[PDB]
Design a protein around this ligand. Structure first.
Ligand SMILES: Nc1ncnc2c1ncn2[C@@H]1O[C@H](COP(=O)(O)OP(=O)(O)OP(O)(O)=S)[C@@H](O)[C@H]1O
Ligand SMILES: Nc1ncnc2c1ncn2[C@@H]1O[C@H](COP(=O)(O)OP(=O)(O)OP(O)(O)=S)[C@@H](O)[C@H]1O
Ligand SMILES: Nc1ncnc2c1ncn2[C@@H]1O[C@H](COP(=O)(O)OP(=O)(O)OP(O)(O)=S)[C@@H](O)[C@H]1O
Ligand SMILES: [Mg+2]
Ligand SMILES: [Mg+2]
Ligand SMILES: [Mg+2]
Lengths: 257, 257, 257, 257
DNA sequence: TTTTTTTTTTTTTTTTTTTTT
DNA sequence: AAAAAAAAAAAAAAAAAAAAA
């Protein structure tokens, strides 16, 4: 069924190139070469996690020799109230090693051992705020002992957590401020969105002012909302037998927010 | 004894089709297809929980194959000050899997494993206000890692809890409002009520204005009160040897509120 | 005495054909042909062990020459904290060989000799959890060295044991999820039960709703409870000089659970 | 019967040339010439044991002289909790000598006599982790006294055992890490597998993306799972009278994992 | 400025058995 | 007939990061 094939596609996710994503990638590349600690802070739904995923794919692990694959970048997202056994477990699994039964001290060395050999140029710890304060000692140890940069990406609240510990605050001072869209950048993003993200049989012309003012009021510059508003409107429109998104559909969806 | 058979019936509960229930079911069906996460908020005794139960029965689990049943929808109601071990336990038991002794970090993974295979297209959490703030991290993780929609049903107080966390508030921005009954919808509901819920030997004619003004003052548009006023009046009337509800009985019951 | 003859019969056990048993039987038949090693997991009192017994009798020993019997399938149930000398002893006795005095290293080899010669295409080890972890090495060796598939039937707790050893977990990934009864399948099972298991002089009509709601509340879908509730009720009823089971008897028995 | 002839074939096993197997053979060849003890560690079902078997067959025993058969490479797999009498017995039997009744101190010396004479350049001990710690002394003695290199092939758990003894850890420091398949290597392996391992009359075109995404999700890069999924699907397909594997069959089998 | 509420994270110990020699 | 080794678990508080009037 054509309709179901398009809905199964639309409900899915993809990465769209944006000025903000390229900016982060070039910035992280500098910190990687210099091995310097830094921070990534911005508002929710601005597309910070997605840009980090894209970076991991930009430079993939290289395995041209018999030895363990050389993984230049490690990306992890700690669970809630993450303790020191959990941080080490997740780093080790990411690099494809199995963790054996033992205590924190027992595989701490193993984490170091697995960290060595593989390149591990940079460690990106998304959602840094969700971590027990005691674990920031093991993060500093890694950053200090090994030639590894620790990006530590987080939301605005993270700064409230970082400032509670002098030694952490004075080691992660450099920061990039991820932001939201406004002005022409938003209009160009909507034009990009229609053509690449949407494969609808008939064009919706979402760049038009009459509907762009609606997308602007509904979105407020958050790339996460633009994705929801247009992705749901496309499925709701096709489900009615339409070949494009009607102004009435954009209004009907916007009213739910 | 005929009288006791009718009292044993009247003291029981049933689901009556209403415009508000159909409206929610069609709305949830859209969010299910789009895998969109959104809240359901309204006043107490408006019949929010009952509409959610009716939805679960609309799409029942399928057992055609010898494989584990594909449950399209999961409905749970967390206990007071629900923590992260309790949320996972209740989801797992709802899928007929028994939980073994272990830590959150052990059956957090089992939950994901039971979540995979079973369809679990949508997760409805009633009494969303009854969650420790720390648990909203495990809810976001589920909503993010897998394509599952989370309803997060709650009362007006839920909004006061949601706005305390930026990341949670942004994710659940879309909402549906239950409301209450007023005008013709109430009169038609009373007519439906006497016909479908009350089966007294002789008709009471509750639609009549002389008694409808009483039901209106006593219920103030809450389907929960209309249920109580008429269900108690029917038992109290039969217990006196009456075949119908007298105006005097409706007045006597209303005076207690 | 007629009464004692019926009680001596009722207190006994028998195998009733069910949809779950046939499903189980023909799934095992696929694994047997493919020589695949797979696990089978189910809740207590769902009739997992009985279905395995029925399978053994479906595929009986065949003797076409003076050579040892061509035993197609082996079924064993290990004792508590079963060690490697005990697993080998029980396999060997099952095939009707006497075990001589010696060490594990002596009749480990004798076990291989008698696993050979006879076909022994399948080995079903019920209650797999009750086994010392060290013995899973001898089970893998059999499964690896000989063209034999091993079932590993067990309860939910078995999965907690299996996941403690990487090499066992990976080998035994395929699974069948034995379940409980609900809906029409339960009503039809009660009709079958009264139809075949119970031969009372006068019919009880256990499929009627007034008593079926009682059997449902008392049974909760477990075939083991339906068997207890009706088997005890039949003996208790006959002992009172009744020719059928009265609603009062089903209620009296249900109250004990 | 054609169908049974194909099933009797499909249920069997064979060795498929792979990049990982050639890599190990060239690596072991270097250690053999240098007489250097070394390790082989990787995950379960990655095809570690099969590559070792292929190596033994690459360099078969040569018997062109008066002296006893010269086996350059010896391959053994110790039983569970293998002690020092068992290690010596299995080495001696492999070289085709009968072991007489006596003590460890008697055929410890007989083992040395038969290790000598025959070239015995390399000893490959599979499943090294399942060995008694006391036996590693007899392994070091062989490696130290005789010009013989010992491989010590095993899983991730072996490293936890090795690090418990300083003298063993230092001796076996060199290692080759086995890796699972990902990317193009997996797609090319599926194409190769269909051509050489499957002799089905009608081509299945398993390289196609629609079914390759299914094989990828079901396999997760483990050559052991790709073998199982496709080998069972071929038997299940032929048993239905099909000349090829249908997408429906690959899905039906994948659902069991 | 107070008063719980709980959570994991910890080892130390004490016995019991199943074979080798 | 006298020894060595490998389990295989139930204890009994306890210092403390975090939280609610
Ligand atoms: N470059 C992009 N291309 C396509 N979609 C994007 C992009 N960036 C963000 N999104 C959308 O944003 C949604 C949420 O992902 P992110 O915005 O990356 O999450 P986030 O930035 O971590 O915000 P949080 O939840 O506060 S941490 C996804 O559903 C994406 O569709
Ligand atoms: N298909 C069946 N036919 C007849 N009796 C059955 C059947 N299934 C279960 N029973 C009854 O259940 C008892 C046997 O236990 P099972 O029902 O097999 O429980 P189980 O599945 O073995 O669960 P456990 O406790 O884990 S062994 C006997 O008393 C049988 O009479
Ligand atoms: N060259 C090959 N040709 C055909 N089948 C192969 C080949 N290599 C591996 N396999 C299959 O994939 C599985 C994995 O190989 P194994 O011999 O199990 O190595 P392994 O998984 O490292 O051993 P374990 O599980 O750690 S004891 C085997 O059971 C084979 O069926
Ligand atoms: Mg995020
Ligand atoms: Mg049983
Ligand atoms: Mg192997």
């Amino acid at each position: 069924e054509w309709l179901q094939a398009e809905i199964a596609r639309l409900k899915g996710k993809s990465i769209v190139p944006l000025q903000q994503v390229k900016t982060l990638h070039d910035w992280l590349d500098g910190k990687r070469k210099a091995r310097k600690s830094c921070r990534v802070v911005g508002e929710s739904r601005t597309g910070k996690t997605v840009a980090c995923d894209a970076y991991r794919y930009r430079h993939k692990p290289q395995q041209e020799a018999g030895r363990p694959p050389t993984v230049p970048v490690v990306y992890i997202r700690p669970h809630q109230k993450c303790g020191p056994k959990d941080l080490f477990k997740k780093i080790t699994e990411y690099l494809k090693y199995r963790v054996t039964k033992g205590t924190v001290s027992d595989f701490r060395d193993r984490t170091i051992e697995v960290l060595k050999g593989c390149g591990v140029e940079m460690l990106i710890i998304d959602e840094a705020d969700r971590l027990k304060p005691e674990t920031f000692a093991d993060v500093r140890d890694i950053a200090e002992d090994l030639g590894i940069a620790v990006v530590l990406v987080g939301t605005d609240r993270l700064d409230a957590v970082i400032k509670r510990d002098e030694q952490v605050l004075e080691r992660f001072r450099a920061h990039l401020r991820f932001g939201k869209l406004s002005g022409e950048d938003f209009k160009n993003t909507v034009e990009m969105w229609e053509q690449m993200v949407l494969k609808l049989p008939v064009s919706s012309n979402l760049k038009s002012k009459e509907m762009l003012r609606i997308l602007t009021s509904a979105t407020e510059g958050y790339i996460g909302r633009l994705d929801e508003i247009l992705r749901e409107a496309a499925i709701r429109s096709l489900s009615r037998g339409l070949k494009k998104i009607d102004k009435a559909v954009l209004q009907e969806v916007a009213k739910e927010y």
